Amino acid sequence: SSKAASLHWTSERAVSALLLGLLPAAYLYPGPAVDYSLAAALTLHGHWGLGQVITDYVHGDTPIKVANTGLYVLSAITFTGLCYFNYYDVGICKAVAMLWSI
Amino acid sequence: ATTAKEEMARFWEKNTKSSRPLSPHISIYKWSLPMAMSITHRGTGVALSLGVSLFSLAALLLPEQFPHYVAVVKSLSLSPALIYSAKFALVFPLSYHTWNGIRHLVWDMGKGFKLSQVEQSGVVVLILTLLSSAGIAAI
Amino acid sequence: AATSRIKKFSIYRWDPDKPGDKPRMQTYEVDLNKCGPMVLDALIKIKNELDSTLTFRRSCREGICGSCAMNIAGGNTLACTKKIDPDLSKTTKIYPLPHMYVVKDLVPDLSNFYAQYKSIEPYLKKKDESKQGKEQYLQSIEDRQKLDGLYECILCACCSTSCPSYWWNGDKYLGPAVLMQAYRWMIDSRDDYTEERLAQLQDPFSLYRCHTIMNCTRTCPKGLNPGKAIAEIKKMMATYKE
Amino acid sequence: ISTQYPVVDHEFDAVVVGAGGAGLRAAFGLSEAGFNTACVTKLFPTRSHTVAAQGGINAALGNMEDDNWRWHFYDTVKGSDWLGDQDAIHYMTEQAPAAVIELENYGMPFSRTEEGKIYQRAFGGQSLQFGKGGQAHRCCCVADRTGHSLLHTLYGRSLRYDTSYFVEYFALDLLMENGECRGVIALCIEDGTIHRFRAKNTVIATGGYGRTYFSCTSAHTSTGDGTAMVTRAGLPCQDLEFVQFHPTGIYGAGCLITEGCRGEGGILINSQGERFMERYAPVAKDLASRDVVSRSMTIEIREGRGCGPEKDHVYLQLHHLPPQQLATRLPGISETAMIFAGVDVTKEPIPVLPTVHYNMGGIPTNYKGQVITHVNGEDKVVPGLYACGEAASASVHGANRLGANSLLDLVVFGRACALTIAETCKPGEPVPSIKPNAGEESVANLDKLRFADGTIRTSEARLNMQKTMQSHAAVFRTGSILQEGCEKLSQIYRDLAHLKTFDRGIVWNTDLVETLELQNLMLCALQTIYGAEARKESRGAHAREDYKLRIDEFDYSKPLQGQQKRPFEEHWRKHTLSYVDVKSGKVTLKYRPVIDRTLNEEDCSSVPPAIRSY
Ligand SMILES: *Cc1cc2c(cc1C)nc1c(=O)[nH]c(=O)nc-1n2C[C@H](O)[C@H](O)[C@H](O)COP(=O)(O)OP(=O)(O)OC[C@H]1O[C@@H](n2cnc3c(N)ncnc32)[C@H](O)[C@@H]1O
Ligand SMILES: CCCCCCO[C@@H]1O[C@H](CO)[C@@H](O)[C@H](O)[C@H]1O
Ligand SMILES: O=C([O-])C(O)C=C([O-])O
Ligand code: SF4
Ligand code: F3S
Numbered sequence A: 001s002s003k004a005a006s007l008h009w010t011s012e013r014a015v016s017a018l019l020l021g022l023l024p025a026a027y028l029y030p031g032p033a034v035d036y037s038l039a040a041a042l043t044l045h046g047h048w049g050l051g052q053v054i055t056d057y058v059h060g061d062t063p064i065k066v067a068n069t070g071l072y073v074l075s076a077i078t079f080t081g082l083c084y085f086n087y088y089d090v091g092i093c094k095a096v097a098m099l100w101s102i
Numbered sequence B: 001a002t003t004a005k006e007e008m009a010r011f012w013e014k015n016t017k018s019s020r021p022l023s024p025h026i027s028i029y030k031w032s033l034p035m036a037m038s039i040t041h042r043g044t045g046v047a048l049s050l051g052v053s054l055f056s057l058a059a060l061l062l063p064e065q066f067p068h069y070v071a072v073v074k075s076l077s078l079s080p081a082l083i084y085s086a087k088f089a090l091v092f093p094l095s096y097h098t099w100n101g102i103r104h105l106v107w108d109m110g111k112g113f114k115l116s117q118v119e120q121s122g123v124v125v126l127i128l129t130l131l132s133s134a135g136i137a138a139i
Numbered sequence C: 001a002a003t004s005r006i007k008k009f010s011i012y013r014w015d016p017d018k019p020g021d022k023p024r025m026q027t028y029e030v031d032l033n034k035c036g037p038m039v040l041d042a043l044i045k046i047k048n049e050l051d052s053t054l055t056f057r058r059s060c061r062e063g064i065c066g067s068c069a070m071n072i073a074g075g076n077t078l079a080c081t082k083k084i085d086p087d088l089s090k091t092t093k094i095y096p097l098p099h100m101y102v103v104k105d106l107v108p109d110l111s112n113f114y115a116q117y118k119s120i121e122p123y124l125k126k127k128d129e130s131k132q133g134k135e136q137y138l139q140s141i142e143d144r145q146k147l148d149g150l151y152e153c154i155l156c157a158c159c160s161t162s163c164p165s166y167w168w169n170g171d172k173y174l175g176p177a178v179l180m181q182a183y184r185w186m187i188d189s190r191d192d193y194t195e196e197r198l199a200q201l202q203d204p205f206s207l208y209r210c211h212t213i214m215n216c217t218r219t220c221p222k223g224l225n226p227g228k229a230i231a232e233i234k235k236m237m238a239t240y241k242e
Numbered sequence D: 001i002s003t004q005y006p007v008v009d010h011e012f013d014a015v016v017v018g019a020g021g022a023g024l025r026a027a028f029g030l031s032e033a034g035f036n037t038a039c040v041t042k043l044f045p046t047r048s049h050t051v052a053a054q055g056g057i058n059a060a061l062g063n064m065e066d067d068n069w070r071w072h073f074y075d076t077v078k079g080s081d082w083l084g085d086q087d088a089i090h091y092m093t094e095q096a097p098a099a100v101i102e103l104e105n106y107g108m109p110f111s112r113t114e115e116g117k118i119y120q121r122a123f124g125g126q127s128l129q130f131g132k133g134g135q136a137h138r139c140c141c142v143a144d145r146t147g148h149s150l151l152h153t154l155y156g157r158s159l160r161y162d163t164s165y166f167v168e169y170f171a172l173d174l175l176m177e178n179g180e181c182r183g184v185i186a187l188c189i190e191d192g193t194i195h196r197f198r199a200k201n202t203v204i205a206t207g208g209y210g211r212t213y214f215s216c217t218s219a220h221t222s223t224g225d226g227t228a229m230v231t232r233a234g235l236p237c238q239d240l241e242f243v244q245f246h247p248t249g250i251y252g253a254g255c256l257i258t259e260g261c262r263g264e265g266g267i268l269i270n271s272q273g274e275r276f277m278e279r280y281a282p283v284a285k286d287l288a289s290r291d292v293v294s295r296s297m298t299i300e301i302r303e304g305r306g307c308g309p310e311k312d313h314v315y316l317q318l319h320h321l322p323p324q325q326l327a328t329r330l331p332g333i334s335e336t337a338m339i340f341a342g343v344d345v346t347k348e349p350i351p352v353l354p355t356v357h358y359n360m361g362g363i364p365t366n367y368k369g370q371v372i373t374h375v376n377g378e379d380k381v382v383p384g385l386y387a388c389g390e391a392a393s394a395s396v397h398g399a400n401r402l403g404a405n406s407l408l409d410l411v412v413f414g415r416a417c418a419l420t421i422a423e424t425c426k427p428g429e430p431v432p433s434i435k436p437n438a439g440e441e442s443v444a445n446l447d448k449l450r451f452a453d454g455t456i457r458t459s460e461a462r463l464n465m466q467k468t469m470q471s472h473a474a475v476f477r478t479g480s481i482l483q484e485g486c487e488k489l490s491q492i493y494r495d496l497a498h499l500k501t502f503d504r505g506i507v508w509n510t511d512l513v514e515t516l517e518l519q520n521l522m523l524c525a526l527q528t529i530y531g532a533e534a535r536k537e538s539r540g541a542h543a544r545e546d547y548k549l550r551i552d553e554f555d556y557s558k559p560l561q562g563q564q565k566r567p568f569e570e571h572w573r574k575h576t577l578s579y580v581d582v583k584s585g586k587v588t589l590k591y592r593p594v595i596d597r598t599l600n601e602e603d604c605s606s607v608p609p610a611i612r613s614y
């Protein structure tokens, strides 16, 4: 894609917006659908986010390869664990409600 | 003539092997509120992500489920002040980052760039953060 | 005359011809009653009267040439239009533009900054330039106005050397100054290479290391907004076709 | 002698010294023509004084009313008070429209009219119909920052050619051999090294020397270095005594306030609120020639109508103009007035006073940009050496330059040197050898200033020279004062033997570079004030209160019918040629005739001297 970098920049913002929209959605319509939407958006937004950080702060072909590899693992496992929490346990929305009861 | 790339390669080549010092930056530079809020936005984003990661790791690795830990904590019937404190601490970064995040999306549409508007939006972000955070730590 | 007002200036020093010399800060005292109102007046008095080894770039003396950019009291600015601070209880610290290789004292090596500017091809380009010189190109008052706030730049570098992204990735991030000039050519109605100018910024660094910190605009001695120009480039990147 | 300094040798077809408007245009013109060209400059190009230019550049484009370049020719010739060479003036003015259209096509962002064409404003001393038709509007501009745009546009344009730049290299002298220039020797300021650039042709475009004075609009870097190189080479400089005091430098800082202010309707006012120029120049008023307005303002101040607490300046008033106009036509000075005088130009007048601004004199050239020498009554080009821009005396400006004519001169003669070299040489011709030790004396002098340890420090000797020119070679002059000034300067020059410098390094040693600049300014200053003392007549900016008349070969104030023409030796309508013996600092003068012929009498009539008034 000759327009890769700008298509990424646009997706990043599309996702940030997406996630903003999920906050009200979690409060007003909690349940599976939002629970998975949040698992996917929290991971995607955080993965791109931590990647801009590596990009600004990590230098050298190898240290960059390493940071990005470690990030891809952190993210894959993070989206996995969140889907897991949603399938086998109460799920993000309900967990927040419960924690807010303490 | 030297092309721009050649000029760039010799600059690095000359200087990295020179004995020239690198002038100070971050240790001498004057802060501003916008600058401070900027790096706080990055710091809250990283913290929020690390938190979401730690929580998903606990989901894959701890022996009990969420309801047991909630109950455990409750069985300590902790003081309301402390509870409030903690909820406030939890929601503040999320809060700060969401509102300043909205300010960044507004900048992405090209609006609010006069420097005096940058100072205004930052302060509107701080007060909404504080308000929404006291609001929520109270629910 | 008789009744002084002595100000102290703590200024960055480093001599490359003194083997093993280390950067140090030197302090000078100047009678504000016998010096011009600007920091450059002070730097010139010091050089002329106390220490002619103090070295710095300067030329126009009215803030149009861009030579004297440096960091004063924590911020990047032109010494020649920067008022000397009258509160005598404070020492004004002076350093070279930030995160730059120091040639000597307050003189940074700006050659990478200039090579980034050459790389965006800052000159008018027409598809058919076979008519260069025959007649004036027409441009409306309204399209000429689009250039206001972009063309006044004096390439002093206060902005890019204030930008933390530029501090961390100055080898590949073009920085605020050059990006605002690339925008100045992208919107000149008389230029025919807008898509190619945008196409050149399709990589992770040239443009995208800007995260809207806004130090650039706060620091500009000409009152320009490079941070805004950049946001307008990002929008064009996101919408142009072909 | 010993090379304590390593020497690098370069060979090019051509070398351009200077990278302001004239040098950049000459240097890429040469590369565009195929010549392997080097451009040597002591500043990064866009820092050059050209960047500070404001009001505009003239060309009869006729975008505001019908115009004729010959009307411009006339204005310039009258403005030069007949000390201008009309062949050069012909070339300059006829070439103007194409030179400006060239800049616009390069991308120069000129302000625009309702037709999308370049906007032009009124400026001083310009008219329609050879003087009979009212105010011209031919000064093309980019609001009031024309210089800035002109320089940035030329610089961006040079980036398209293969010109080799040696930025922040300080040229020391010319490499002369047998009356011919073989190149130049320079100090690379960044690494302390010495470089000799050999080339078949050398172009000098180093700027003026306003800094020989104490108060000037000129940048700190306007120190006549190229001029001094010519002088050191034993070549003549010309008309150096004609120094332009611009009517309006801001009081105190000296910053230029554009004549565009008055071109757009601003007015000069004395302490009594009188628009005194209606009195001194009833027709032109505040748009009369600069030598005139400056003399008038100066008269108003010594006669008591001065403004401010010391009654020592006057007022430039713009507040009666609509604010949009000031914001659109005059934004730079609007900002400058406030930063340097605290004035809000929509409310209060700007404090102003006549300020040394520009050098009419310089290295003499023919209209093709070739430097000339003058032997036994004839002009001879110096093979291999060209000059253009304020450092030259072509002379399109004679005794007084019209505003907006210098930026024009820059581009027209910088292109002219490139054209002339291109019709005279071919790229790649063998570059002339230079004796193995060419330049060694430049290094010797440099080494000697580095370690200088006398009793008079560089800044001291410089301030001495500045205050001397300031009170002895000002707007109004007289023999006694000029003579005193001459002797004080000659003394200060002997005194350079006692210079003390402190910096002993070689990398970015501005202690030493500014000492080389002092030598340079001293050579220019000596030629100026001795040329002035010798000139017993009043012409353009050179006003002698003891020789109040302009003296030409005829009395052009009565019919020439039955008038005995005066002998070359008994009148002053001739260029001054100054030479300096650098060891002693003694000045020699000679004169050469002004050229009245144009490039084509059928196309552009030569204009005979006449009484000059606005
Ligand atoms: C002072 C001034 C002059 C001026 C003006 C406003 C101000 C504040 N506004 C003008 C206007 O609106 N219209 C107009 O026609 N003229 C105006 N002027 C006068 C005009 O600007 C100057 O006459 C003109 O710009 C002259 O420029 P030129 O090209 O001749 O050179 P320069 O810009 O002054 O630059 C000198 C160059 O030479 C190099 N140099 C000098 N010494 C050395 C040594 N030793 N070695 C190598 N290079 C040298 C400098 O680096 C510089 O590039
Ligand atoms: C020392 C690090 C934290 C400083 C945070 C706030 O800092 C302040 O912000 C103001 C508004 O932008 C500025 O005008 C002011 O100079 C600055 O000190
Ligand atoms: O008043 C000006 O803008 C000016 O200084 C122009 C010339 O030509 O010298
Ligand atoms: S945008 Fe401002 S600060 Fe940046 S280089 Fe240009 S004038 Fe200097
Ligand atoms: S300070 Fe830097 S991050 Fe962007 S807005 Fe300015 S270039």
Ligand code: FES
Pocket: C040, C058, C059, C060, C061, C062, C063, C064, C065, C066, C067, C068, C069, C078, C079, C080, C081
């Ligand atoms: S000396 Fe020219 S910008 Fe300060």
